[PDB]
């Protein structure tokens, strides 16, 4: 992301996240089975506006 | 005690002795007494009887569900060793 964005500029940012269902790749705590049965996962994301 | 003799301790207080009063009664007590205020059941508290949890152990409800279904990818084939 831009240090600053001056007036009239336009600025590009990037950013990543990672939301954990296990706690690691080799610890599955926390994961969960989801074998195709149809009743469906949420992930609900809200955005900066 | 020490008796002395010649002064010897008077063989008693004797009859000289000023009689003061005669108030020497008790009047003995006569009495009835009646507690008699109707008594209705109950008592109001904030608990009586409840042995509280310290602690709860972790509790759950169970589900399951769904198919057996799957996507798989095998080892190709190879040249018998012996046998």
Redo the contacts between chains.
């Keep these: 992301a831009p240090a600053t964005i001056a007036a009239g500029a336009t600025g590009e940012l990037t950013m990543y996240y990672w939301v954990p269902l296990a706690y690691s790749e080799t610890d599955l705590t926390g994961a969960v089975l989801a074998?195709?049965?149809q009743?469906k996962q949420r992930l609900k994301l809200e955005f900066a506006n | 005690a020490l008796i002395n003799p010649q002064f010897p301790y008077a063989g008693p207080v004797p009859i000289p002795g000023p009689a003061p009063t005669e108030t020497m009664p008790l009047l003995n007590y006569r009495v009835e007494g009646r507690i008699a205020g109707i008594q209705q059941a109950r008592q109001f508290m904030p608990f009586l009887q409840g042995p509280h949890r310290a602690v709860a152990e972790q509790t759950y409800h169970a589900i399951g569900t769904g198919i057996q279904m799957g996507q798989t990818f095998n080892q190709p084939l190879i040249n018998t060793q012996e046998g």
């Design positions: 074998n195709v049965p009743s």
